[PDB]
Amino acid sequence: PPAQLSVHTVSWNSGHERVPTNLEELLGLNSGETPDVIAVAVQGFGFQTDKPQQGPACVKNFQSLLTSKGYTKLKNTITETMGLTVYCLEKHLDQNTLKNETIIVTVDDQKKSGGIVTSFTIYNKRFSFTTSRMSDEDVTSTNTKYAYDTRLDYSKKDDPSDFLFWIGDLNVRVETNATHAKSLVDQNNIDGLMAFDQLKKAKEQKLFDGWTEPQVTFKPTYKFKPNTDEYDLSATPSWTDRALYKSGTGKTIQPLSYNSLTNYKQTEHRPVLAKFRVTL
Ligand code: HEM
């Protein structure tokens, strides 16, 4: 059992986008890094029914990439609007203690909103990865629009998880007009634009309680004109894909890196990659 392990998370509100070409860049592997755990989350349209017959390409692309690197896919789960895959280096895995388990929680009759939680145990320490999806119009357990539900929060449990990450588009946005928001972006005033971000409001309403976001240094990841770097000012530029972290048992988690991946310009949102170090 090592003292520390590293985790990479990536999420993307990808819509109808297929898997892109350079996957090492997407998962933060393009500089020789060997993370112990990798988690990939999507939000979009039509995953489960797979009309585009895309799912077999996803498999081939992610197996080509990760099998030789020593990773085992612990779980892939898709719904019509969400996707969550967790990988872990094979060497850390004990079949007798893994206790690999996934839940899906949907809140609407159409099964478009709610979340996925995948959890697993290595070195007697339990990880949970959550992704979630909420739409503005939804009727919710919190009476807010935010993609939080206590059933997706494995810190609120009597045998809580050791290491938890929540990744995906939290339906948290910037609460100011677009004109002002674009002007703060042009001034590189990231912190001044962040003052209007809703995550702090959600936390006031006791949502995402005790969950932490790494310092944000990058410009809003949404809403872009596809295949350009131009904001479509029909929405207030915002931070849609986020990465949050927490321990349910007092463990130390340290963010190493948190960044948008602006080379992936194909749709209205940009992917977000985070890298962490956890102490067992
Ligand atoms: C940027 C876009 C996307 C990413 C990052 C993504 C990623 C993934 C990942 C990581 C898996 C698990 C791979 C593995 O077996 O190791 C997967 C599986 C899947 N993907 Fe995607 N994908 C995307 C787009 C799509 C789209 C657009 C569709 C359909 C409209 C789709 C349908 C599926 C299906 C059905 C599976 C299940 C595959 C199976 O187990 O046979 N994917 N994808």
Q: DSSP character for 143?
A: S
- Please, which residues have CB within 8 angstroms of residue 190's CB and are 6 or more apart in sequence? 184, 216, 217, 218, 219
> CA 66, 72, 76 angle in degrees (round to 5)?
90
Which amino acid is residue 6, in one-letter code? S
Q: How far is CA 257 from CA 14, 85, 213, in A?
A: 22, 21, 11
Residues 19-36, buried b or exposed e (16+ Cβ, 10 A)? bbeebebbbbbeeeeebb
The residue whose C-alpha atom lies closest to atom 34 belonging to ligand 1 is 55
Burial of 75 (0-12, 13-18, 19+ CB in 10 A): middle
Annotated binding site for heme: 58
From first CA to last CA, the distance across the chain in angstroms is: 9
Q: Which residue, by CA, sits nearest to atom 5 of ligand 1?
A: 19
Which tokens in the block code for residue 263? 């080379």
Q: Which atom of ligand 1 is nearest to the CA of 45?
A: 30
Any ligand 1 atom below 6 A from CB of 87: no
Query: In a 3-state reduction of DSSP, which class is residue 81?
Result: coil
Tell me which amino acid residue 92 is. H
| Cα 172 to ligand 1 centre (Å) | 25
Experimental method: X-ray
CB 163 within 8 A of CB 125: yes
- Give domain limits for the chain: 1-280
Measured torsion, CA atoms of residues 103, 72, 48, 84, in degrees rounded to the nearest 10: 50
User: In Å, what resolution does this model reach?
Assistant: 1.5
Q: Report CA(54)–ligand 1 centroid distance (Å).
A: 7
**DSSP codes, 219-260:** ---B-BPTTSS-B-TTS--B--EEEEEE-SS---EEEEEEEE
Q: Calculate how far, in angstroms, residue 32's C-alpha sits from the geometric centre of ligand 1.
A: 24
Which two three-digit tokens encode residue 148? 């939080």
Tell me which long-range contacts 48-55 makes (C-beta under 8 A, separation of at least 24): 48/78, 48/79, 48/80, 49/80, 52/16, 52/18, 54/18, 54/19
Amino acid at 223: K
SS3 105: strand
Closest CA to 131 of 223, 44, 18: 44
62 alpha carbon to ligand 1 midpoint, in Å?
9
CA-to-CA separations, 14 to 29, 47, 214, 236, in angstroms, rounded: 20, 11, 22, 19
Write out the binding residues: 58
**Partners of 84 in beta bridges:** 41, 77
The residue type found at 206 is K
Residue 87 exposed, middle or buried by CB count within 10 Å (0-12, 13-18, 19+): buried
* Statement: 1-280 belongs to CATH 3.40.640.10: no
Per the DSSP assignment, residues forming a β-bridge with 115 are: 105, 132
- CA 85 to ligand 1 centroid distance, Å: 9
Cβ-Cβ contacts under 8 Å for 233 (sequence gap 6 or more): 178, 179, 182
Q: How big is the chain by its Cα radius of gyration, in Å?
A: 18
Tokens encoding 201: 């409001």
For 215, how many CA atoms within 13 A lie in the half-sphere containing its CB?
6
| Residue having the nearest C-alpha atom to atom 27 of ligand 1 | 18
Distance between CA atoms of 103 and 242, rounded to whole angstroms? Answer: 21
Cβ–Cβ < 8 Å for 75, 102? yes
Residue numbers after which the chain is interrupted (C to N above 2.5 A) read none
Ligand 1, residues 58, 169, 263: which to mutate, most atoms within 8 A of Cβ? 58
Q: Which two tokens stand for residue 210?
A: 């005790």
Contact in structure between 233 and 222 (CB atoms under 8 Å):
no
Pairing assessment for the beta strands 114-122 and 241-246 based on DSSP bridges: unpaired
Contact 223, 232 (CB under 8 A): yes
Residue 122: how many CB atoms within 10 A of its CB?
23
Minimum-distance ligand 1 atom for the alpha carbon of 62: 16
For 179-188, which contacts have Cβ atoms below 8 Å and span 24 or more sequence positions?
Answer: 179/233, 181/220, 181/236, 181/237, 181/238, 182/231, 182/233, 182/237, 185/219, 185/220, 185/231, 185/237, 188/219
